[PDB]
């Protein structure tokens, strides 16, 4: 048994900033501080205006990224779980959930801009981190890519759910996991956009 009247509810995922890719310089912007993030997580009511393709998102215990592609805000299950996302009208229930792909999605917030899925078949990719670093990544397989310049894993922590982009700025995949050998990240594993398009058309 358990005392049901006091069972708590997990809060919503909350947008706390964005990666500005609009102009000629990539940079992170914060749109909500720690206090407002916790209040907004509990209510699920986020009145802030949303802009751009890559959002910085937070729960009470984790922070990561979320990327809009074809009208869906995508992120990783290991960050969001089954949580709703805060919105101007209250919590919004997930529209996609696939733990086997480490993938979840909500309807893209009003004001967001969506990336278009890549059709160019290029293997010269670019990973966008939560610090607005644009890291060249050579595609090595359907879901893997190697860093031209390896980095300590610390530099990629908190960027799951961010995009991998082709040279034309099209979405190639969603950053999922890192290939980590003794604290150094040599390569990345991502959800291919085609897997997204299947999840959408499924
Ligand atoms: C050693 C390592 C780097 C920690 C780990 N490597 C690793 O496992 O490599 C193997 C070998 C090649 C691919 C991968 O096969 C296993 C697949 C794992 C997975 F990803 F599909 C995954 N599915 C889940 C589904 C349901 C519930 C939990 C799940 N947990 C998973 O993996 C976990 C999570 C994932 C992670 O940390 N991702 C990143 C991130 O930033 N997160 S985060 O924002 O800070 C944060 C924790 C707030 C959300 C991008 C990498 C950054 F840190 F660089 N992990 C562990 C790793 O990357
Ligand atoms: Cl996949
Ligand atoms: Zn492309």
Swiss-Prot record:
Cofactor binding note from Swiss-Prot or TrEMBL: Binds 1 zinc ion, which has a structural role. The magnesium ion is essential for the helicase activity.
- Domain of life of the organism in this record? Viruses
Q: Where is this region: NS3-binding?
A: 12-21
How does the record say this protein sits in the membrane? Peripheral membrane protein
| Localization | Host endoplasmic reticulum membrane
Q: Which reaction does it catalyse?
A: Hydrolysis of four peptide bonds in the viral precursor polyprotein, commonly with Asp or Glu in the P6 position, Cys or Thr in P1 and Ser or Ala in P1'; a ribonucleoside 5'-triphosphate + H2O = a ribonucleoside 5'-diphosphate + phosphate + H(+); ATP + H2O = ADP + phosphate + H(+)
Cofactor(s) named in the record: Zn(2+); Mg(2+)
Q: Which residues carry out catalysis? A: 78 (charge relay system), 102 (charge relay system), 160 (charge relay system)
Give residues annotated as binding Zn(2+) 1: 118, 120, 166, 170
Ranges for domain Peptidase S29 come to: 25-202
Write the signal peptide boundaries: none
Report the protein's function. Answer: Displays three enzymatic activities: serine protease with a chymotrypsin-like fold, NTPase and RNA helicase. NS3 serine protease, in association with NS4A, is responsible for the cleavages of NS3-NS4A, NS4A-NS4B, NS4B-NS5A and NS5A-NS5B. The NS3/NS4A complex prevents phosphorylation of host IRF3, thus preventing the establishment of dsRNA induced antiviral state. The NS3/NS4A complex induces host amino acid transporter component SLC3A2, thus contributing to HCV propagation.
Instruction: Please give the record's comment on domains.
Output: The N-terminal one-third of serine protease/helicase NS3 contains the protease activity. This region contains a zinc atom that does not belong to the active site, but may play a structural rather than a catalytic role. This region is essential for the activity of protease NS2, maybe by contributing to the folding of the latter. The NTPase/helicase activity is located in the twothirds C-terminus of NS3, this domain contains the NTPase and RNA-binding regions.
Q: How does it assemble?
A: Interacts with protease NS2. Interacts with non-structural protein 4A; this interaction stabilizes the folding of NS3 serine protease. NS3-NS4A interaction is essential for NS3 activation and allows membrane anchorage of the latter. NS3/NS4A complex also prevents phosphorylation of host IRF3, thus preventing the establishment of dsRNA induced antiviral state. Interacts with host MAVS; this interaction leads to the cleavage and inhibition of host MAVS. Interacts with host TICAM1; this interaction leads to the cleavage and inhibition of host TICAM1.
Q: Can you name this protein?
A: Serine protease/helicase NS3
Q: Which organism is it from?
A: Hepatitis C virus genotype 1a (isolate 1) (HCV)
Q: Complete protein: which residues are present?
A: 1030 to 1688 of 3011
